[PDB]
Design a protein around this ligand. Structure first.
Ligand SMILES: Cc1cn([C@H]2CC[C@@H](COP(=O)(O)OP(=O)(O)OP(=O)(O)O)O2)c(=O)[nH]c1=O
Ligand SMILES: [Mg+2]
Ligand code: NA
Ligand code: NA
Length: 306
DNA sequence: CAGTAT
DNA sequence: GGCAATACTG
């Protein structure tokens, strides 16, 4: 009933969380369409509403049929459409083990021992199925330090191209120097088993940022929001890049006056906090560290599904 | 920006 | 008025 939040999932993020008011009391054409269409990667409430309003599309299947004829679709949208059916299949844990092994092996080959790959997401939380593959790529603790952001070396792009040349990565939804989102497909195993294409995210992370990145990219999402609210309540900013002690709420505002000023982020470029934000860093070497500073009991990854 | 993604 | 926080793109 109050599961009519799938409805509010048309953007009302805070109204959604709320159902998850009395009530004691206890749809629409384009709304159900929008509900359907926002299943497709690249289509949020507004893009979906636009498909309904300007294209007369009620259904994903109609969108698949009509996609090539609609010039206004982004490349990201066309990939989401092409792979829609594969994207809706859950990945069994045993297959994620193979993605992990594969990614680790190819990382060693093209990048060498200075680099490391870790799979996070619902997989690290030991769910029997996952929606996608969330990888973190980072330099090891023993790798010699760089004089620039690792993202500036173009290494994510190089890794992506290597994987493409192997026909593992076969379609790109979006790619910058920090984050790659696309479709990856394991090579056939020989009866020959052909694999479906899976959603693969790769995040390039600085070595000192790995513990907080592992927290973030392991999630779950609700878990992240909870831990971040605990941080706020103690005068900290927690993100994938670090734990930053900002102080009182007005000291935080002051800081953001210099460093944030954006609808972008608190003050990082290429995954490296600006110097004034970096001065706020509380160094951590483990997930446990973060829990400790925030006064929360450690939770194993499989217990981060609140 | 103002949409899309995580 | 604000709510977790950040990345990529037309
Ligand atoms: C969407 C979102 C996600 N995160 C974190 C939390 C997890 C990782 C991966 O996200 P995912 O949607 O794959 O979720 P995941 O837990 O891996 O589940 P599935 O892949 O769907 O199995 O990113 C976040 O901090 N804020 C967000 O708005
Ligand atoms: Mg995931
Ligand atoms: Na969507
Ligand atoms: Na691009």
């Amino acid at each position: 009933q109050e599961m009519a939040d799938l409805n509010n999932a048309l953007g009302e993020k805070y109204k959604v969380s709320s159902y998850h008011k009395l009530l004691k009391k206890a749809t629409k054409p384009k709304l159900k369409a929008i509900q359907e269409l926002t299943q497709v990667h690249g289509f949020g409430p507004r893009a979906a509403a636009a498909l309904f309003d300007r294209e007369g599309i009620f259904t994903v299947d109609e969108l698949l049929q009509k996609a090539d004829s609609i010039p206004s679709l982004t490349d990201q949208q066309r990939v989401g459409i092409k792979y829609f059916y594969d994207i809706n299949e859950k990945i069994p844990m045993q297959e994620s083990v193979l993605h992990e092994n594969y990614l680790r092996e190819k990382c060693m080959e093209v990048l060498g021992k200075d680099f490391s790959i870790l799979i996070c997401g619902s997989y690290r939380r030991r769910h029997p199925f996952s929606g996608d593959v969330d990888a973190i790529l980072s330099r090891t603790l023993d790798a010699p330090p760089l004089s620039e952001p690792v993202a500036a070396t173009g290494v994510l792009g190089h890794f992506v191209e290597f994987l493409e040349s192997l026909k593992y990565l076969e379609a790109t939804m979006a790619q910058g120097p920090l984050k790659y989102m696309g479709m990856g497909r394991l090579p056939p195993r020989i009866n020959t088993k052909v694999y479906k294409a899976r959603r693969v995210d790769i995040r390039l992370i600085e070595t000192k940022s790995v513990p907080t990145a592992m927290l973030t990219f392991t999630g779950s999402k609700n878990f992240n929001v909870i831990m971040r609210q605990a941080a706020i309540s103690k005068g900290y900013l927690l993100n994938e890049y670090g734990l930053f002690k900002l102080g009182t709420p007005e000291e935080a505002r002051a800081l953001y006056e210099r460093i944030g000023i954006r609808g972008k982020n608190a003050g990082e470029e290429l995954g490296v906090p600006k110097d004034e934000l970096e001065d706020k860093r509380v160094e951590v070497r483990s997930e446990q560290d973060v829990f400790d500073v925030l006064g929360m009991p450690y939770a194993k990854p499989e217990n981060r599904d609140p």
